[PDB]
């Protein structure tokens, strides 16, 4: 886990809006789609379209994980970035993301499994809110997003400017697997590309046993 000194201070971030739009804006979601092309052996290009993009490239953990989902019909769910997102030169409407991929076949729930987010502020966990998905194995990225989307819009986690909280991070807790966490705030001078790499591992989770806690301080 993280120590107060391991956490990035929000008041130290330059252009924090750049995080804000990532979570304030809608995600990139797709259902039964198959890998169309590939730039580097560790990424997968999809001919999926969306507002502001007709192509999507996702960077995965490595080549192995990239060929592992290559010829499979997967579901995509992720927070994208455009600045520093290049492929060829004719594709002028592209968008990049890391991970956020999962097998489509046999990964669906007839009824959404809502997970309980334990938001603790300044040590007092006086808040609880739901978050749901239709996948049995979902990526921490799909869960992580919703968490921040909720908190942004209700607790003002982010704004088109500063943040009411000095520090903050999301902690994930797998049934029996070991835990991990993501710092809601970046380094002073960051880039969405670099920051988003917290989803490059594409670490999925069993939404039927996984737990989620959030630690925010003012
Ligand atoms: Zn699906």
UniProtKB/Swiss-Prot annotation:
Gene3D superfamilies: 2.40.50.110, 3.10.20.120. One of its GO terms (molecular function) is toxin activity. Disulfide bonds join 85-96. It comes from the Bacteria. Pfam families: Stap_Strp_tox_C, Stap_Strp_toxin. Binds to major histocompatibility complex class II beta chain. This toxin is coded by bacteriophage T12. Keywords: Disulfide bond, Signal, Toxin, Virulence. The gene is speA. Causative agent of the symptoms associated with scarlet fever, have been associated with streptococcal toxic shock-like disease and may play a role in the early events of rheumatic fever. This is Exotoxin type A. GO terms for cellular component: extracellular region. It comes from Streptococcus pyogenes. Belongs to the staphylococcal/streptococcal toxin family.
